Subunit: 253 residues, 4 copies
């Protein structure tokens, strides 16, 4: 009952972290709108979860997002929390192999899609004293190899979260982000499968954490439910869900 009576939109909710966040909110008593550009996972999740419904929406398309918000309000009468989870990590790319074109496309998804939904949702979040949760990335803070565009987009999300928290504080709307590290999801599996030795890549990904494993969508979901339902004095925070990966680390020429 921690979030009973509330209405939550989760973008990219059809699989991976997003689906874990959907499940955590349904388990907390909320009604959840699953937004995804892909019908397969999200439609099945609606059938599985009473309290969740699926709305096809590509967050890079402004009119899709307008309809997502208007349909959420039409169907459920309020909006309490937006979780901006839709995002992508390209395959590893050396800096000279990236392009401004690809960088712009990744900004459209990872940054501007979050911006667009948040902007359209904020009038309703102000009415409900609701909150925004952005899914950023640990590597926005610490960097990652072979990922210049991705890292830039996530540094932008974390910073934007802090700016918006300042602007929306007088109106009672909290704005926070979660920065996951290595979470075992279909994206992780897909990227590993591109590598010469996928099993070795996966093993390395597990050992990057002091805890010796990758994280689960459910663990990101629990962090999101905490931020929405019990973190009433938290705004503009970056909540790390990383298993400790950021901890620790002639001869001098």
């Amino acid at each position: 009952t921690r979030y009973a009576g509330k209405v939550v939109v989760v973008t990219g909710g059809g699989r991976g972290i997003g689906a874990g966040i959907v499940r955590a909110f349904v388990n907390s008593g909320a009604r959840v709108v699953i937004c995804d550009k892909d019908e397969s996972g999200g439609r099945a999740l609606e059938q599985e979860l009473p309290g969740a419904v699926f709305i096809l929406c590509d967050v890079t398309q402004e009119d899709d997002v307008k309809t997502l918000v208007s349909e959420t309000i039409r169907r459920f009468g309020r909006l309490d929390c937006v979780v901006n989870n839709a995002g992508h990590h390209p395959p590893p790319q050396r800096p000279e192999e990236t392009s401004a074109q690809g960088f712009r496309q990744l900004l459209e998804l990872n940054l501007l899609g979050t911006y667009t939904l948040t902007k359209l949702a904020l009038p309703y979040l102000r009415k409900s004293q609701g909150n925004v949760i952005n899914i950023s990335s640990l590597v926005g803070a610490i960097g990652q190899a072979q990922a210049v565009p991705y890292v830039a987009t996530k540094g932008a999300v974390t910073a934007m979260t802090k700016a918006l928290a300042l602007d929306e504080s007088p109106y009672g709307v909290r704005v926070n982000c979660i920065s996951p590290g290595n979470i075992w999801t279909p994206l992780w599996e897909e990227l590993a499968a591109l590598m010469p030795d996928p099993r070795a890549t996966i093993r390395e990904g597990m050992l990057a954490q002091p805890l010796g494993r990758m994280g689960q969508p459910a663990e990101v979901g629990a962090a999101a439910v905490f931020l929405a339902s019990e973190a009433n004095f938290c705004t503009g925070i970056e909540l790390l869900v990383t298993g400790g990966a950021e901890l620790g680390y002639a001869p001098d020429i």
Copy 2:
């Protein structure tokens, strides 16, 4: 039921943030040992809360802490979480008014008391796959005026949390900290009362947060229950409970 069957020790649990943490854990289903050097608040809290008991213990006294741990195990049979909350903020002091003697005394409480209980508790936390929660301070990260010793002690706590998280990760024990900002507690009230215009000082303390108020012990308590019970992929994190105080901020000579 989020933490049912678990046993938690909260130091400085007789009033303020510590009492809020005690209440949050009792509400989650845990049994709680209230440690305090002062009988008044903690004894009343035991009477009030089924599931909480009071043990007199000054965390700066090694034998008191040894007895705290042995009595917790004798009475409850396990130990799952230690919350190192006991600590103090001296009245505002200019650097030249501080002393090495006073600095050492504050280190004994704010830093070494946390170290001592954690060390004595860790064998039991390893058996239960339990966790440590240290109550640090936002100003350990960002500084504060007229508080050189206090700030130093809290920078030490936050750093120590990260080091211990690394060391205890192979054993399945997570170690995290909460960094509160301005929380309305008897300590805050006592410090304000020393100032020339206490009401003005309190007003200034409220407006230091974008949220326009100070935080509550209950909000720190909810963050602690989250870290203990649902943050299984979080270790070595600093969870800010500050209301956004860290956000934002000839002419050039």
Copy 3:
């Protein structure tokens, strides 16, 4: 002589921080290419400074940047340091007053212009074991009110700096950023002039720093010369030039 024989490109070098960086590098013995989209300041600076030349270049235009690099190499035979300083802060804008269109345009300048020049320069920086210096912003790290797009762009720059530092480390190219706070420049003067009480706004800007004044272009310039010429074990750092602005900060409802 600290940077004698070296060749430096400074974008946005015609006024403000960029001109201060140009002067600092000329004073260190380097030859400097002043890039700017505006001829007025940069052309005068060339006439004033032996060792500096002006090249008209809008960093948002890929062909302009290609020509900037090819002309630098044609005229000077090497390239040792790129300082990505061109950038803009829009007038204060509430989140609901911003647009995706304006956000994209600001990303083109503050983020993608930095990306584009860095990419085109890197083959030459690898040959010289040179370095990249990005001018980010303190508010990328801590947030700012009425500046969601700006803050996002600068969070991206700081993060991108760390990612590129990782990628270019095997090749001996260091990549660092400077995050200024309030620096008294024509941009600051222009933004203040839009406000109802410009003098009051300027006074507030000075008092945001514990040092009680704004910074100077020359101080950012000295930090840049340090990073280029003497910081050989620094890569991926964020060097704050802020005057301490990030330091420090019923009642509980």
Copy 4:
């Protein structure tokens, strides 16, 4: 001539990083007082460097530090910069192998010695508009394995630097810290020699940095001269000299 006419005290200046800092300041034109508890290195350094003199002083002994300051003023007539470099890293120690006694002793050196000299020097630094430079450690920020006391002491130093910067800003005294990573010094060599395979330990220490080597005392020294002589808008900063070590990092159970 960057720091000509100025007087600098470097603690632990007889070898390692401290000796590198001494050399960098002498090369900048300053007169330097080498403080050390060990005569061997510091006495030889005085003989070698015109402009440097050696004063025997154990920074944990208050009367030694009082004499250090009074002798500096008696001999040189002013004091412009204090570099608190004396410190120690114990051999790797598991948390259960540490003691409160050893922790207190390490606090006396790494934290309280810095506090004591700074306090005694500040009246003179206010007269000269001088500055304080504390040598902290990257692992104060990110943690390290088998080093709970050390990490705590360095977290305290970094935090204390920020608090004192706030307090001394109205008086025109800047207070900054440098956080080195792996620097090749006699301490590093001594710790490696205790390990089963010292050469393997050294190799691992080099590869912890993206730059693929450890740092040099001279590089820390250049950062110190920058902070003293050219960073006039920097106070309360943590300048990382780490080679990038902090950058970057069933399957989910």
